[PDB]
Design a protein around this ligand. Structure first.
Ligand SMILES: COc1cc(Nc2c(C#N)cnc3cc(OCCCN4CCN(C)CC4)c(OC)cc23)c(Cl)cc1Cl
Length: 270
């Protein structure tokens, strides 16, 4: 298959975390002397189908702000997904721990711009991401941000993907139509992206603070939305609000979102 490699080609270095879809390691791809991230699957389990689903999809994708697949090991346990190493880890912990004088307003714009660029790409390729949130974005040197892409679905025929009944979603990031009917689309991602913008603007606060999960849907029904975070530019909140339109069709495209952030980033850098 050519994405296939010898498991003996990697040496494991440190556990970084995991559970999960599988546990995650810092590793070294020996013949390139290259630090890499390795997702692992101990034995066969029920979650093996999950695994190669990710693997398959990640091969179909290439973008500067999408985590680059390097190789896979899928002939027998253990199982390896191998990606580039995102040095600073996830964006949520990053925002929370950063030096805000360094990671300032111009930088937050840069990060929104980078993410929206990735999502514009997925929009065109007819992909949806099932879990857009700060925790699923990764950070490298110099405020480089990439969206993690193990949880992607290709739209094979049409507009909306339907998740299996009984599926649990991260309530606070999830579009109304997704919570209600289990339907995901690129416009559901646009909604989630709105939440992501709020996380970025607040340096990683939890969305709908103190609000009871079980009541979020009802609130959204009655046009309750999160308020403008402190220091968030009015235009940025306007976009947030556009992302959170009740009708999917009323929400902007990622092409529009990216264009808008590109413009704001150019002006901020001037
Ligand atoms: C390869 O397979 C997969 C791997 C992943 N997950 C990761 C990808 C990817 N992709 C890339 N890069 C990662 C870097 C990580 O931490 C590196 C440094 C952390 N530190 C925090 C403390 N300080 C300050 C030093 C830095 C990390 O930690 C858990 C997970 C990463 C996913 Cl989500 C899915 C699949 Cl399929």
């Amino acid at each position: 298959d050519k994405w296939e490699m010898e498991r003996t080609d990697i040496t494991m270095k440190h556990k970084l975390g995991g559970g999960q879809y599988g546990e995650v390691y810092e590793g070294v791809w020996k013949k390139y002397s290259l630090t890499v991230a390795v997702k692992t699957l101990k034995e066969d389990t029920m979650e093996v189908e999950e695994f190669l689903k990710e693997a398959a999809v990640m091969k179909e994708i290439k973008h500067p702000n999408l985590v680059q697949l390097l190789g896979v090991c899928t002939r027998e346990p253990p199982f390896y997904i191998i990606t580039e190493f995102m040095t600073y880890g996830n964006l949520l912990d990053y925002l929370r721990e950063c030096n805000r004088q360094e990671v300032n307003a111009v930088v937050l714009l840069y990060m929104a711009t980078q993410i929206s660029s990735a999502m514009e790409y997925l929009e065109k390729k007819n992909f949806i991401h099932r879990d857009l949130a700060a925790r699923n974005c990764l950070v490298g040197e110099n405020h480089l941000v990439k969206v993690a892409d193990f949880g992607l679905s290709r739209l094979m025929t049409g507009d909306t993907y339907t998740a299996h009944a009984g599926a649990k979603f991260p309530i606070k990031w999830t579009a109304p139509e997704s919570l209600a009917y289990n339907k995901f689309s690129i416009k559901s991602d646009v909604w989630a992206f709105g939440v992501l913008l709020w996380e970025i603007a607040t340096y990683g606060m939890s969305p709908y603070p103190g609000i009871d999960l079980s009541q979020v849907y009802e609130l959204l029904e009655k046009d309750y939305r999160m308020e403008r975070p402190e220091g968030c530019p009015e235009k940025v909140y306007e976009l947030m609000r556009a992302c959170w339109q009740w009708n999917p069709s009323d929400r902007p495209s990622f092409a529009e979102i990216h264009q808008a952030f590109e413009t704001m980033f150019q002006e901020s850098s001037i």
